[PDB]
Ligand binder design. Structure first.
Ligand SMILES: Cc1cc2nc3c(=O)[nH]c(=O)nc-3n(C[C@H](O)[C@H](O)[C@H](O)COP(=O)(O)OP(=O)(O)OC[C@H]3O[C@@H](n4cnc5c(N)ncnc54)[C@H](O)[C@@H]3O)c2cc1C
Ligand SMILES: Cc1cc2nc3c(=O)[nH]c(=O)nc-3n(C[C@H](O)[C@H](O)[C@H](O)COP(=O)(O)OP(=O)(O)OC[C@H]3O[C@@H](n4cnc5c(N)ncnc54)[C@H](O)[C@@H]3O)c2cc1C
Lengths: 494, 502
C-alpha cells in the first residue's frame, strides 16, 4: 500500500500523467477511477447498427499548435491509418421563416460577423481596466455603435448568427462572459475517429495493473509525516509520496462545501487552501450537451457538414435597435418586448452532418445551457425528444432538398431510427461539460491556484488547470504531462 | 513674403493641415503644390458618358476606427448626402481553366486561407522573433508544414488565392515582406463616392488665396537666423516660421541623391538628419495601379462586387510539394520549374471591382501590382494593346458571370452596339509610377523592412520648424488616406497651439 504517485481520475489528464511517469522510469504508481471505464469526458458510445459516436469531446481543436493532435498525425503518417478527418466546412445557417441565410448576396451576414468579432477584439484586446459584460450585451453594444452601417435584415439576423459561439462554451449568450467569448482558434479543427482510440493508446502506455476502476476516492490527507494518505470508498487505504488530482472542476468544488456524502466529493485534510477555495468564485462550469439523431439512410444534400439553426428573431427587435438612444434605453425597451415556452427555435443549435464527412447517416447536434439540462433530464423519453426537435429537423431536411422526418424509432423520406443523448449534467463524476466563464469571471485565478498545487505533494491536473487548451482535451492532456514531469524530476533527486 | 506656415503639397495631408490652421484662427499661410490641381493621390476622373472614377484612393479603410470615415458618416447624418457605400462582398475567385473556385464544397479554399493567415500570425508573434522573408516564402512553408492536411487542389489553388494580398500592398508576393503582409482590417471598408468630395470639402475650408498651384518647391533652408526659406522652381522665394512638408516618401527619398535636376526633388540645408536618411533603407514604396473598364450597360450577373482572377497554376506544383523533403529541396525543385515565357493577364492575380452591383455603374475597376503596374501604365495611351492584353481575363469573367465574350466598341464612329453581349466603350489607366510627383502608389514593406523607423523620424520632424506629414509619417492608417489626413491635423494642431501661446 506504499506508492510513489497516485493519480485520481482516468480521464485524459490522468492517463497522460501515468503514461509520462512510466516514460520517465517511475514505478509503483496507481490510477484510481470512480467509473468502471477510463476516458472521463472522452467517451465513445454505440448506437443503431453498431454506429460509433463521441458523446463527449469529438474534435482535435487548434491543429496548428495542438500537441496531442500532432502525435496522432505523426502516427497516421507512419502507418496510414485514418484517425481523424478535417471536417471544417462552409456553415449553412437556417432561420425558421426565411430558410437558408448563409452566403447571401444581400444579407452578407458572415462579413458583418467578422466585423463584430473585430469589434470585440478592439473592445478588450488593446485595453486594460475594461469592465466585462455578457456576450449578449456586447452584441447589443455593437449594433448600437454600427446601426448606421447595417441594414434592417442585418440587424435582425446577425445577433442570432453570432450565437454559434454559445456552442463553443456550452452557455447561453446572456450567461456568457464577453471578455472570454472570442478566443482565437489556431487553425482548423479535426474530427476524431474516434477519441476512444486516443484514450486506449495512452491507457496502454503504462503498466495495466496501475489502473483501479470502480474506485471512488473519498478523502485525501497530508500528515506532517510528508506522505499523503488516500482513502477509497471500498475501505482501501493507500500511502503515496505524491498525488495528482484530475477530477473535474465541478467535482472538486464539492470539497469546499460541508455536505460529505456527495458522489465524487473528496474530503481534504488539511482543507484546500483559501486561494483555491476562493478561485471557485471566479470561474464556473458550462453545459455543452449532445444529441445524436440516427437515420436509416442519407436522403439529404451533403453540401455541408456544418449546419446551424438560428433562434427566432423579430422585426420589432430591429425597430427597437434603431430607435433606442443608448444602451440603457435599449435594455428597457427589450424587456417590455419580452413581457412563452422554450422550443427548438428558442436558441441556436449546431448540427453536424456526419454523412458528408464520415459517410454515416446521422446528425450530431450540440446544445447549450440552459437547454442542455432540460434535455438531459428527459433523455429517456424518446417520443418527447422527437416532438421537441421535430420542427428544426424538418426545416433542415427541407433546406437540404429532402422531406419531413418519419418517426421509425419503434421512399426518399428520412426515417429516424434512434436518438442518443449525453448525460454529463446528471453524471456525478462530471457534473457539467467543462470550465466556462460567466461575466466577471477570471479563469487565470483557478489556473494559477491549480498549477501551484495544494502543497508540494498534492497536485492538480485537468482541463481547468491550464491556460493553453483551457477546456480542451489537449489542455487536459498537457496538464497531465506537466504534473508528471515535475514529479518525475523531484523523484530522481532522491 | 513673410508667412506663419508654409505647407508643401496639397494632397489630403496638406489640405487638412491648412484646414486645421484656418480652423484655429491662424492667418497668412500658404499651400504650395507642384501639380496644376489639388488632391495628390486622391484624384477622381471622368470617363465615358460622364461616369466618374477614383483613379487613386477609392475606399475608406478600417471603418470601425477610421476617424476620417467617422467624420464623413457624421456629415451624412447631418446633410443627407450619400458619400460612400459598403461594398464588402463575398469574393468570386476565377481560375482560367476551372472557372469559379470560391465557396466550393470540395476546395474550401477560404477556410485554409484563414488557416494560413493564422499560421502567419503564429510565425511572427512567438516570444522569439524570427527573420522576415517574402510572402511567397511564407506560403511555401505553410504548404510544406501542412501538406498532410491539404488535398491536391487545395495545394494547387490556395497559394494563388492568397495572393489577393498583393492588391493590398501593390507588390508581387516575392517582393513583399511576409511580416507586413497580414495586418488587421478594423472592420469593413467603404467605397467612397467619391474622394473628390472629400478633397473639395477640406480644400474649401481655408482661404483660396492660400493655394499656389504649379508651384514646385526645389529647396528648403533653415537660416541660422532662425526662420525657414522656401525656394520655388520659378524663382519665387518665401519666408516662414514653420513648414509642413507632405510630399510623398518616394519624392522625399530624392533628397538623399545629389542631382538637383530630379523633378520634385527638394534641396535641404542643412541636410535631412541621419536618422531620417537611414530610415529610407528600412521602408520602400509599392505600385498599386488601376485600370477602369467601361461598358455600355450591365449584362452580367451582379452576385458580387468583388472578383479576383487567380494567376495560372499547375498540377506539377502539387506534385513538387508532395515530393519535397525540406525547404531547400522545395526551392530547388521550384526554381527548375520556373526556368522551364511572356507576361500575360494570367501571370498574376488581378482584383476586379464590379461597380454595377454597388454603384449601378456599368464598369469594372481593376487593381494591379508591381511589376505589372509600370508596364501597363507605360502603354496607357494604347487602347487596342490594353484591350488585347486584358481580353482573356475579361472574357473569362463574363463567362463565369453568365455572360458572353466582350465586344470592342471603343470607337464611336463605328456605331458598335449589341443587346446580349458586353460592349466595351473605354479603358482608363492610372499613371502613378510615371508621375514624378508620386513615383509609385504608397509606402510598402520589402522583406526586412521596418516602417517604424520612418514614422518615428518623420513624426519627430527635421527640426522644430521643419515638419513632415503624409501617409508615410504615421502608424495608424499608414499608407492610407486617413493616415495622411490625421498626420496633417497632427502637425497643424501642434503648430497652431504653439502660435496661440505666443
Ligand atoms: C459534450 C462535451 C463536448 C466536448 N467537446 C470537446 C471537443 O470537441 N474537443 C476537445 O478537445 N474537448 C471537448 N470537450 C472537453 C474535454 O472533454 C475536456 O476538456 C476533457 O475531456 C477533460 O478531461 P480531464 O481528464 O481533465 O477530466 P475528465 O476527463 O473528466 O477525467 C477526470 C476523471 O476523474 C474521475 N473522478 C471524479 N471523481 C472521482 C473520485 N471522487 N474518485 C476517483 N475518480 C474520480 C472521473 O470519473 C473522471 O473520469 C468536450 C466536453 C464535453 C462534455
Ligand atoms: C492607386 C492608389 C490606390 C489607393 N487606394 C487607397 C484606398 O483605397 N484607400 C486609402 O485610404 N488610400 C489609398 N491609397 C493611398 C492614398 O492615396 C495615400 O495614402 C494618400 O492619398 C497620401 O496622401 P498625402 O497627402 O500624404 O500625399 P499626396 O496625396 O501624394 O500629396 C502630396 C503632394 O505633394 C506634392 N508635391 C510633390 N513634390 C512637390 C514639390 N516638389 N513641390 C511642391 N509640391 C510637391 C504632390 O503634387 C502631391 O500632390 C491609394 C493610393 C494609390 C496610388
Amino acid at each position: 500500500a506504499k506508492k510513489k504517485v497516485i493519480i485520481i481520475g482516468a480521464g485524459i489528464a490522468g492517463l497522460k500523467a501515468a503514461s509520462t511517469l512510466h516514460q520517465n522510469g517511475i514505478q509503483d504508481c496507481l490510477v484510481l477511477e470512480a467509473r468502471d471505464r477510463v476516458g472521463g469526458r472522452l467517451q465513445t458510445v454505440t448506437g443503431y447498427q453498431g454506429r460509433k459516436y463521441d458523446i463527449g469531446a469529438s474534435w482535435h481543436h487548434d491543429t496548428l499548435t495542438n500537441p496531442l493532435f500532432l502525435e496522432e498525425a505523426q502516427l497516421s503518417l507512419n502507418d496510414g491509418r485514418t484517425r481523424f478527418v478535417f471536417d471544417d466546412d462552409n456553415f449553412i445557417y437556417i432561420d425558421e421563416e426565411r430558410g437558408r441565410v448563409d452566403h447571401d448576396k444581400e444579407l452578407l451576414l458572415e462579413i458583418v460577423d467578422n466585423e463584430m468579432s473585430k469589434f470585440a477584439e478592439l473592445e478588450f484586446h488593446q485595453h486594460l481596466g475594461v469592465s466585462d459584460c455578457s456576450f449578449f450585451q456586447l452584441v447589443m453594444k455593437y449594433l448600437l455603435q454600427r446601426r448606421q452601417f447595417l441594414t434592417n435584415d442585418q440587424i435582425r439576423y446577425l445577433p442570432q448568427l453570432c450565437r454559434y459561439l454559445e456552442l463553443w462554451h456550452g452557455l447561453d449568450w446572456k450567461l456568457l462572459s464577453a471578455k472570454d467569448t472570442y478566443f482565437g482558434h489556431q487553425g482548423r479543427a479535426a474530427f476524431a475517429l474516434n477519441y476512444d482510440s486516443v484514450v486506449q493508446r495512452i491507457a496502454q502506455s503504462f503498466p495495466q495493473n496501475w489502473l483501479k476502476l470502480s474506485c471512488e476516492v473519498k478523502s485525501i490527507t497530508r500528515e506532517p509525516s510528508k506522505n499523503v494518505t488516500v482513502n477509497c470508498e471500498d475501505g482501501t487505504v493507500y500511502n503515496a509520496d505524491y498525488v495528482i488530482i484530475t477530477v473535474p472542476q465541478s467535482v472538486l468544488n464539492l470539497s469546499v462545501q460541508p455536505e460529505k456524502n456527495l458522489r465524487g466529493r473528496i474530503e481534504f485534510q488539511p482543507p484546500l487552501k483559501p486561494v483555491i477555495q476562493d478561485a471557485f468564485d471566479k470561474i464556473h462550469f458550462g453545459a455543452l450537451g449532445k444529441v445524436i439523431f440516427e437515420f436509416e439512410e442519407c436522403c439529404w444534400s451533403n453540401e455541408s457538414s456544418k449546419i446551424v439553426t438560428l433562434a427566432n428573431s423579430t422585426n420589432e427587435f430591429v425597430e427597437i435597435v434603431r430607435n433606442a438612444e443608448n444602451l440603457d434605453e435599449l435594455d428597457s425597451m427589450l424587456e417590455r418586448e419580452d413581457s412563452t415556452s422554450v422550443t427548438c427555435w428558442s436558441q441556436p443549435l449546431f448540427f453536424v452532418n456526419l454523412s458528408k464527412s464520415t459517410g454515416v447517416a446521422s446528425f450530431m447536434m450540440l446544445m447549450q445551457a440552459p437547454l442542455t439540462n432540460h434535455i438531459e433530464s428527459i433523455r429517456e423519453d424518446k417520443e418527447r425528444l422527437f416532438s421537441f426537435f421535430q420542427p428544426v429537423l424538418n426545416k433542415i431536411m427541407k433546406c437540404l432538398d429532402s422531406e419531413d422526418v418519419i418517426d421509425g424509432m419503434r421512399a426518399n423520406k428520412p426515417v429516424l431510427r434512434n436518438i442518443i443523448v449525453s448525460n454529463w449534467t446528471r453524471d456525478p463524476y462530471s457534473r457539467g461539460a467543462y470550465s466556462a466563464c460567466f461575466p466577471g469571471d477570471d479563469p487565470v485565478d483557478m489556473v494559477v491556484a491549480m498549477s501551484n498545487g495544494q502543497d508540494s505533494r498534492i497536485r492538480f491536473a485537468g482541463e481547468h488547470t491550464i491556460m493553453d487548451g483551457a477546456g480542451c482535451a489537449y489542455g487536459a492532456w498537457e496538464s497531465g504531462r506537466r504534473e508528471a514531469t515535475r514529479i518525475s524530476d523531484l523523484l530522481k533527486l532522491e
